[PDB]
């Protein structure tokens, strides 16, 4: 899954 | 002697309270700044005991204009450049947009909020380039208005950058900003590259600022941003009858103190108006909307338009459309 800051959740791009 | 204009404060609070209710949201904030003086004209939390003006969030698409300005300054692109925006991999990670375009102009990159386009600009420049530009527009700098939790956001002092980190930074992720910080970014856009401190006390204009970016490049990108609030742009719901506006709308997910994401969205719109000769910078943030819409363009763009239109009328700004 995503994590901050190394693998962020990005609008419009899973 | 406070800079807040109580007329603007009252219409900001009214519209923000209505939008928070309509979206069944936890909360919202709005900050309105004079792009010539740095004066805070309105600054509201809804509900009024939820102190969210200083909450941090990943600024997302609101940084993309800064990526275009930096690419133009460095000569990676020219004003009429066309980017190849076909989805591709960075270190195995698929880079894609909401809608696939094979190619976009720089205006298209903002209109369509192209992650593919901005990633290619980012990876054509040293990792230091966007770190310098964002810093020039005040990201990672304190705001100093005297509010609880105020501080300086979450800004990287990073020695080592993977390709995917360089790309996500160009998308506005892996750093956090406050609403005040982002409003100051958009005030620096509205002045065409003059950085000024925020003030909650009155000042007499003109206010000398720091030249942090060339006027020609900032004005180029302000005109490109106008597309975002026109049909086929991500911020069309923010459009105001009679006015040109320069905005970006975006979305983040809320980060816990473990740096893990939870399924709460943060919807925002940042902008200046009127785009022909900017007067105001506005940031609207809607936290944890729960009425089936989550993204900036759906949740926060309408209230940006309602507030900015109300400000432009109240302040007797001449319509600049057509
Ligand atoms: C960890 C790699 C990374 O930073 N990204 C991939 N990604 C996910 O793993 C989901 C959390 C989203 N990112 C994108 O750049 C999507 C286009 C960031």
Q: Does domain B1-321 have CATH number 3.40.710.10?
A: yes
Residue B64, sorted as left (phi over 0), alpha (psi -120 to 50) or beta, turns out to be alpha
Contact criterion met (CB < 8 Å) for A11 and B175? no
The span from the CA of B310 to the CA of B7, in Å, is 10
Q: Where are the domains of chain B?
A: 1-321
Query: Which mutation among B60, B95, B164 tests ligand 1's pocket best, with the greatest number of atoms within 8 A of CB?
Result: B164
Contact criterion met (CB < 8 Å) for B174 and A1? no
Report the pocket of ligand 1 as residue ranges, CB < 6 Å: A 2, 7-10, 13; B 93, 95, 115, 164, 167-168
Q: Which residue, chain included where needed, has tokens 């994590």?
A: A3
Catalytic-residue membership of B27:
no
The span from the CA of B61 to the CA of B170, in Å, is 9
Q: Which residue, chain included where needed, has tokens 């926060």?
A: B300
The span from the CA of B173 to the CA of B169, in Å, is 5
**CA closest to A4 among chain B residues:** B259
Give the torsion through C-alpha atoms of B101, B172, B166, B192, to 10 deg. Answer: 90
**CA closest to B116 among chain A residues:** A13
Q: Which residue, chain included where needed, has tokens 């190394």?
A: A6
Q: Which residue, chain included where needed, has tokens 């320069």?
A: B246
User: Hey, of B59, B64, B153, B261, which one would you mutate to test binding to chain A, going by the most A CBs within 10 A of its CB?
Assistant: B261
> What is residue A7's three-state secondary structure?
strand
A vs B: CB pairs below 8 A: 55
Q: Output the six-digit token pair for B318.
A: 């001449």
Picking from B250, B229, B227, B244, the residue whose alpha carbon sits closest to that of residue B278 is B244
Cβ atoms < 10 Å from Cβ of B93: 17
Distance between first and last Cα of chain A: 10
**CA closest to A7 among chain B residues:** B174
The span from the CA of B104 to the CA of B172, in Å, is 20
Q: What is the 3-state secondary structure (H, E, C) of chain B?
A: CECCCHHHHHHHHHHHHHHHHHCCCCEEEEEEEECCCCEEEEEEEECCCCCCCCCCECCHHHHHHHHHHHHHHCCCCCCCCEEECCCEEECCEEECCCCCCCEEEHHHHHHCCCHHHHHHHHHCCCHHHHHHHHHHCCCCCCCCCCCCCCCCCECCCCCCCCHHHHHHHHHCCCCEECHHHHHHHHHHHHCCCEECCCECECCCCCCCCEECCCHHHHHHHHHHHHHHHCCCCCCHHHCCCCCCCEEEEEEEEEECCCCEEEEEEEEEEEEEECCCCCCEEEEEEEECCCCCCCCHHHHCHHHHHHHHHHHHHHCCCCCCCC
CA distance A9 to chain B (A): 7
Distance between first and last Cα of chain B: 39
Instruction: Using only the alpha carbons of chain A, give its radius of gyration.
Output: 7
Q: Output the six-digit token pair for B186.
A: 């958009």
Counting other chains too, the contacts that B87-92 makes at CB distance below 8 Å and 24 or more residues apart are B87/B116, B88/B116, B90/B119, B90/B123, B90/B163, B90/B164, B90/B167, B91/B162, B91/B163, B91/B164
Query: Which mutation among B93, B116, B162, B171 tests ligand 1's pocket best, with the greatest number of atoms within 8 A of CB?
Result: B93
């Amino acid at each position: 899954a995503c994590s901050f800051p190394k693998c962020p959740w990005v609008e419009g791009c899973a | 002697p406070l800079s807040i204009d109580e007329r603007l404060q009252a219409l900001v609070y009214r519209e923000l309270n209505n939008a928070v209710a309509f979206n069944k949201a936890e909360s919202g904030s709005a900050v309105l700044v004079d792009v010539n003086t740095g004066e805070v004209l309105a600054m509201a939390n809804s509900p009024g005991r939820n102190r969210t003006i200083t909450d941090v969030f990943e600024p997302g698409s609101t940084v993309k204009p800064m990526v275009v300005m930096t690419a133009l300054q460095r000569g990676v692109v020219r004003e009429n450049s066309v980017l190849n925006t076909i989805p591709y991999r960075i270190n195995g990670h698929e880079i894609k947009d909401v809608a696939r375009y094979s190619e976009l102009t720089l205006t298209g990159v903002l209109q369509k909020s192209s992650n593919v386009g901005v990633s290619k600009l980012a990876l054509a420049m040293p990792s230091s380039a966007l770190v310098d530009t964002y810093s020039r527009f005040g990201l990672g700098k304190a705001t100093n208005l005297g509010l609880v939790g105020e501080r300086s956001g979450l800004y990287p002092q990073k020695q080592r950058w993977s390709d995917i980190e360089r790309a996500t930074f160009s998308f506005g992720y892996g750093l956090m900003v406050t609403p005040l910080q982002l409003a100051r970014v958009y005030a620096t856009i509205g002045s065409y590259g003059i950085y000024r401190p925020l003030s909650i006390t009155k000042v007499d204009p003109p206010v000398p600022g720091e030249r942090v970016f060339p006027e020609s490049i900032v004005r180029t990108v302000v005109h490109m941003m106008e597309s975002v609030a026109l049909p086929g742009g991500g911020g069309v719901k923010a459009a105001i009858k009679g006015y040109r506006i320069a905005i970006k709308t975006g979305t983040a997910k809320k980060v816990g103190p473990d740096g893990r994401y939870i399924n709460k969205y943060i919807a925002y719109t940042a902008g200046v108006a009127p785009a022909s000769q900017p007067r105001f910078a506005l940031v609207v943030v809607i936290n944890d909307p729960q009425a089936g819409k989550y993204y900036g363009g759906a949740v926060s763009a309408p209230v940006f338009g309602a507030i900015m239109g109300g400000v432009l009328r109240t302040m007797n700004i001449e319509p600049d459309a057509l």
